Amino acid sequence: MPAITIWGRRNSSNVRKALWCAEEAGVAYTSIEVGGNGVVPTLQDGALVLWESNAIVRYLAAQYAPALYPQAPAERALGDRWMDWTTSTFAGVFRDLFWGVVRTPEAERDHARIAAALTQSGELLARADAALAQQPYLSGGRFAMGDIPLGSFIYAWFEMPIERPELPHLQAWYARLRVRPAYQRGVMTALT
Ligand SMILES: [Cl-]
Ligand SMILES: [Cl-]
Ligand SMILES: [Cl-]
Ligand SMILES: [Cl-]
Ligand SMILES: [Cl-]
Ligand SMILES: [Cl-]
Numbered sequence: 441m442p443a444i445t446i447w448g449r450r451n452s453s454n455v456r457k458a459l460w461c462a463e464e465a466g467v468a469y470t471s472i473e474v475g476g477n478g479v480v481p482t483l484q485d486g487a488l489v490l491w492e493s494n495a496i497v498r499y500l501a502a503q504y505a506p507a508l509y510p511q512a513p514a515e516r517a518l519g520d521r522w523m524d525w526t527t528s529t530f531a532g533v534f535r536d537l538f539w540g541v542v543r544t545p546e547a548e549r550d551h552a553r554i555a556a557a558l559t560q561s562g563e564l565l566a567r568a569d570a571a572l573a574q575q576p577y578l579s580g581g582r583f584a585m586g587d588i589p590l591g592s593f594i595y596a597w598f599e600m601p602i603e604r605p606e607l608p609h610l611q612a613w614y615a616r617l618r619v620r621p622a623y624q625r626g627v628m629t630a631l632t
């Protein structure tokens with residue numbers, strides 16, 4: 441049994457973050473899920489226990505995948521600002537939309553709240569589309585850990601049966617993310 445364990449459901453965007461990053465590092469790890477652990481993802485590595493997504497991504501990068509963890513604080517800030525932005529500004533907005541269209545059973549849905557989250561999610565993502573029009577990645581010129589938090593959400597953004605606004609840089613960014621095998625293994629899971 442490996443030293444690293446990741447509790448949590450594989451169809452969670454937060455868990456995709458930890459899984460993808462773990463897959464990006466190459467470490468051996470265990471993924472425990474319940475079918476038919478004090479939080480959405482729980483990362484235990486030795487004595488260390490975390491139940492918070494962007495800190496997990498940030499820890500496994502610094503500890504096992506330093507290419508994803510830029511050494512200069514000023515360079516790190518370019519991508520790190522997008523890690524908190526995903527959590528502070530986009531997640532809650534996007535979580536409602538996703539819950540509306542995939543997880544409430546029938547068309548008995550708050551069609552007004554769903555339509556609201558879609559517009560606001562598009563408005564917010566449009567700001568990330570503008571950043572991706574200046575540099576190829578959220579972390580700068582190369583891919584790094586700053587791309588991982590929104591990258592795990594953007595999978596569900598583009599695969600939901602919703603009417604997306606035209607965000608071409610954001611989509612091209614998503615096209616490059618899918619070339620990464622760790623992304624295919626960590627993020628591109630069944631969109632349940
Ligand atoms: Cl989601
Ligand atoms: Cl350790
Ligand atoms: Cl915590
Ligand atoms: Cl940028
Ligand atoms: Cl179109
Ligand atoms: Cl297109």
